[PDB]
Design a protein around this ligand. Sequence first.
Ligand SMILES: Cc1ccc(CN(C(=O)N[C@@H](CS(=O)(=O)C[C@]23C[C@H]4C[C@H](C[C@H](C4)C2)C3)C(=O)O)C(=O)c2ccc(-c3ccccc3)cc2)cc1
Ligand SMILES: Cc1ccc(CN(C(=O)N[C@@H](CS(=O)(=O)C[C@]23C[C@H]4C[C@H](C[C@H](C4)C2)C3)C(=O)O)C(=O)c2ccc(-c3ccccc3)cc2)cc1
Lengths: 144, 145
Amino acid sequence: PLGSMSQSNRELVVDFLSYKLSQKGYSWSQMAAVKQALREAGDEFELRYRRAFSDLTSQLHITPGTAYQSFEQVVNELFRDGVNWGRIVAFFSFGGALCVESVDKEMQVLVSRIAAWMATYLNDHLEPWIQENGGWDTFVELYG
Amino acid sequence: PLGSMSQSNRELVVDFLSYKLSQKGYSWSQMAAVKQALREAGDEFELRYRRAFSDLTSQLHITPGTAYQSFEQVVNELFRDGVNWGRIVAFFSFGGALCVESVDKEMQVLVSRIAAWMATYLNDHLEPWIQENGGWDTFVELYGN
Ligand SMILES: Cc1ccc(CN(C(=O)N[C@@H](CS(=O)(=O)C[C@]23C[C@H]4C[C@H](C[C@H](C4)C2)C3)C(=O)O)C(=O)c2ccc(-c3ccccc3)cc2)cc1
Ligand SMILES: Cc1ccc(CN(C(=O)N[C@@H](CS(=O)(=O)C[C@]23C[C@H]4C[C@H](C[C@H](C4)C2)C3)C(=O)O)C(=O)c2ccc(-c3ccccc3)cc2)cc1
């Protein structure tokens, strides 16, 4: 019978197939294609701007009392000269480094908080620009 | 829909953060850890058994006319002598190679059908073994040492 294990097994199938296709330059779906391009873009960005990115991550002193306001202020400096795809990649890489740092410092509780901050920032600040500049599909075209 | 951006942007955040955490040996969730261990196990298996795996994948070529039974027949031979985690990894890798081949042959439509055959096989055949052998959490523990 179709219980809860069948649902989680389907999720594993989709994830594994998405991975294998991506290794050959193919994609499970357009969403998987966006996820893959953004994973690779973040790696490329972190490699190209290692030293300058280290200076950015050091600007936010994450503690269990850190509110969205503090994250928004640092991220706003990133988009000071306007929005572009590269600055959006830097934004994802920044939230990415904050999560790693939180777990390193045994503050795993902050990971869910960071994820919610990122979603709010995207929706409030970046989504209108993303829509006006061809959506995530254009980012995939440009990156590939 | 009213919640479509909220859903998709959240999905992107979760995916990217899961990826960054995994690169440093951490995991977003227990499900993310299962997914990562299975991705790495698949790569390991494919590397260790390159020649034997080539013999297996050459047994089946999916066309728009291929029925589930042809897939189930080949997969059944993987588990004729019993189930273990390594044979489960080989099953996932097998499905992955069938999907790659479908896209190589410009038949991307078959990838969702293969994924549904894999889910059916797991539900109809492997759930009792997975449960009895400690679930996917035991696979993660065993693979990680
Ligand atoms: C993968 C990647 C590679 C490079 C960059 C570097 N960069 C730019 O290259 N900026 C371009 C404008 S752009 O449209 O963003 C160009 C893109 C080229 C391809 C396809 C698509 C996504 C990627 C990769 C960027 C467009 C410019 O100004 O000439 C930047 O926008 C940039 C952003 C942030 C920092 C930075 C670094 C450390 C602390 C704070 C900020 C530096 C450069 C960012 C990502
Ligand atoms: C990542 C990986 C590495 C090796 C194998 C090879 N292998 C075994 O090594 N089998 C073990 C028993 S086991 O419980 O599967 C051991 C595991 C060790 C770690 C942690 C966890 C998942 C992985 C990796 C296997 C348990 C044995 O027999 O002593 C096999 O069971 C095996 C399965 C299928 C084929 C095969 C090859 C080509 C065409 C068709 C089938 C060959 C060997 C499969 C995966």
